[PDB]
């Protein structure tokens, strides 16, 4: 187990570009859209639907069609500086509140 990168510097600069990320997927059979994933800073590992964020290093799996890449990114890797850059702290807050509230019900 590795800690999430919370610095302003990407953990995997090889995957810093959208096109670089998109190449990793190949033919992608999974319920969640590869371009959507690549935009949320994810690249494929080639092991089921395992993705890793290029910046935080944060890893996700088992994508249900209801699950959103940016939402999941914020859920599991709230300290990601890439996430904060693209989405903003107001978005991130909303998502946390929504998830933390989802539990109540
Ligand atoms: C998209 C969504 C993700 N979600 C959480 C998830 O995928 N997380 C949460 C956690 C941070 C605990 C975690 N740690 C390891 C892996 C594995 C991994 C993947 C990529 C990789 F590069 C290296 C390792 C995944 C993972 C799914 C539900 N998860 C499925 C897994 O078991 C925990 C459960 C709650 C539902 N779908
Ligand atoms: Na592939
Ligand atoms: Zn990240």
From Swiss-Prot:
The record's account of how the chain is modified after translation? S-Nitrosylation down-regulates its E3 ubiquitin-protein ligase activity. Autoubiquitinated. Ubiquitinated by TRIM32; leading to proteasomal degradation.
Ranges for region Required for interaction with DIABLO: 82-103
| Ranges: BIR repeats | 18-83
> Domain of life, per the record?
Eukaryota
Q: Where is this cross-link: Glycyl lysine isopeptide (Lys-Gly) (interchain with G-Cter in ubiquitin)?
A: 75, 81
Q: Which residues bind Zn(2+)?
A: 53, 56, 73, 80
Consequence of changing residue 63 to A: No effect on interaction with SEPTIN4 isoform ARTS
Task: Give the residue ranges for region: Required for interaction with SEPTIN4 isoform ARTS.
Answer: 15-30
Q: Which subcellular locations apply to this protein?
A: Cytoplasm; Nucleus
Which tissues is this chain's protein expressed in? Expressed in colonic crypts (at protein level). Ubiquitous, except peripheral blood leukocytes.
Q: Which disease is it linked to?
A: Lymphoproliferative syndrome, X-linked, 2: A rare immunodeficiency characterized by extreme susceptibility to infection with Epstein-Barr virus (EBV). Symptoms include severe or fatal mononucleosis, acquired hypogammaglobulinemia, pancytopenia and malignant lymphoma.
The entry's function note states: Multi-functional protein which regulates not only caspases and apoptosis, but also modulates inflammatory signaling and immunity, copper homeostasis, mitogenic kinase signaling, cell proliferation, as well as cell invasion and metastasis. Acts as a direct caspase inhibitor. Directly bind to the active site pocket of CASP3 and CASP7 and obstructs substrate entry. Inactivates CASP9 by keeping it in a monomeric, inactive state.
Query: How does the record describe its quaternary structure?
Result: Monomer, and homodimer. Part of a complex composed of SEPTIN4 isoform ARTS, XIAP and BCL2, within the complex interacts with SEPTIN4 isoform ARTS and BCL2, SEPTIN4 isoform ARTS acts as a scaffold protein and stabilizes the complex. Interacts (via BIR3 domain) with DIABLO/SMAC; the interaction inhibits apoptotic suppressor activity. Interacts with HTRA2/PRSS25; the interaction inhibits apoptotic suppressor activity. Interacts with TAB1/MAP3K7IP1 and AIFM1. Interaction with DIABLO/SMAC hinders binding of TAB1/MAP3K7IP1 and AIFM1. Interacts with TCF25 and COMMD1.
Q: What's the entry's take on its domains?
A: The first BIR domain is involved in interaction with TAB1/MAP3K7IP1 and is important for dimerization. The second BIR domain is sufficient to inhibit CASP3 and CASP7, while the third BIR is involved in CASP9 inhibition. The interactions with DIABLO/SMAC and HTRA2/PRSS25 are mediated by the second and third BIR domains.
Which family does the similarity line name?
Answer: Belongs to the IAP family.
- Name of the protein described by the UniProt record: E3 ubiquitin-protein ligase XIAP
Q: Which organism is it from?
A: Homo sapiens (Human)
Q: Which gene is annotated as encoding this protein in its UniProt record?
A: XIAP
């Amino acid at each position: 187990m590795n800690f999430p990168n919370s610095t302003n510097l990407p953990r995997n600069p090889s995957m810093a570009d959208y096109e670089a990320r998109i190449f990793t997927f190949g033919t992608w059979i999974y319920s969640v859209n590869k371009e959507q994933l690549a935009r949320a800073g994810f690249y494929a590992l080639g092991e089921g639907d395992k993705v890793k964020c290029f910046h935080c290093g944060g890893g996700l799996t088992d994508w249900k069609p209801s699950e959103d890449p940016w939402e999941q990114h914020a859920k599991w890797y709230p300290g990601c500086k890439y996430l904060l850059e693209q989405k903003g702290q107001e978005y991130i807050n909303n998502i946390h509140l929504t998830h933390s509230l989802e539990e109540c019900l």
